[PDB]
Amino acid sequence: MYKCLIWGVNDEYTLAYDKLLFEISKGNLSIEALISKDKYAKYIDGKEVIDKTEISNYEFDYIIIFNKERYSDIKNEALELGIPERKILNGKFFFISNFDFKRYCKLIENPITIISDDCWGGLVSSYLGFKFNSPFINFYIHNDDYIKFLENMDYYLEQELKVEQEGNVYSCTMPKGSLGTGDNKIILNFNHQASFAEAKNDWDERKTRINKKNLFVKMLIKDDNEKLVKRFDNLPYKNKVCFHPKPMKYKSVAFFPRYIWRCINYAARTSNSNLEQYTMDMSWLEKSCDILKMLCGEEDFIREKX
Template structure:
């Protein structure tokens, strides 16, 4: 059972409170108290209330930040600057994740999983988990044929330098974005305005990579590419496809939902944001076999 301290008690605290209670009832956590700036009661929801300074000095395993969610990164950085370990600071909003389990979340944090993805799935997944980007494959996309070549020769390509190639126009963003080359692989940094910014983020996040804990993801509508992906030697991998398949590493949106239709890549991204009940993301990233939340009729 983990001892939990909470700081602040605003709207995010209210929205996550029932989920906190469930983890307590399951015997996963014990909340030792809440630290507040303005103390208006001795107890809130049965939890002792004290100052933030006092709660930080108490013995706890993990600290939950329950302030405004948009300020989480800033508050976490401040706590780290005064000596609190980053891996012990969580957003209280993670408790609202579908099928959340405290023990599985701690396992995910401690494993330091680096997600490799050819589209937005990796970034959306990290955002959903309120986790640090431990991969350079964020806020960008890679054409499917290029991506599979990269994965088939991973060590070679990851030792290449990122070089500016050209700019392309994005009609949805109504602006140009930089395209770089990693050897002969195109990296489309469509969430960046300049190559310099994209290059800086690539190397900054590349340094954080945990090569021992790679999770490789792909989305493709090509059966040939999906088969090549399935043959890759990565221990943890998944490829999302819109067609029925028996490939070991594939998750078929069509097989799970016979009425599946829509823009395929958008559907895969919605899975990463938790908008569709499909898989348990913590079990998936932790390498557990029973990660699917749906099954075929018996």
């Protein structure tokens, strides 16, 4: 449970009010004071309105800024005031589907380092406003090779990234990478970077951020391959999930009924088998599951069943 200060008391603030009350009712936080450039009143919702200058007069776990656009600038004034970035939250993330401050802060205080075969992880981190505490951003690795990696992680994480393809834009060729050497070599298909070198840079830099104390492992398996799914369901990893087109007896398997529905009924649908699009589109993911609950490693995070 935390103590917080709120910077910004306008539209976003009153718009996020009910959620704030709810979060307080759950006992996840309490508002100490309200920071505001312009002073509309000396007390807003029974809370003293103070200046950035008198912030030092309060004890607090976070500053939650409620100002969509001007956020960045306030974050600076925050930093310029000696407040460590660690205690500055965007507040707009309060408007996320199944928000819960305690789960949201948990993932922040014990950095969730997501690991995915595709871009999912990167997207999820953005949707929540988390920082990329993982090297799995902007690239995908085929199932066959991927399962191999999750079974012998540290090893591969020690191997230097070795170009496998340089990539050329005039042949729509993307820079590919390699990790491993024998018939047990792995391939990373970077599809965001221009040149391999640039990709390698990002890789071995972000790599250093892995937080083995809070790892979330996700994998997507489009086709029928109970072999893999069983194999995945067997990884030691305590916190892991696998997206599948159909329900499975394997506990780590997901399956979103709504997906199948879209595949054969959604009119303006885009495809009839793009499960990886469904899982990467927060508009759909949030309807199918409670992301925050899921990432926190809780159970019953799938919102739609049977």
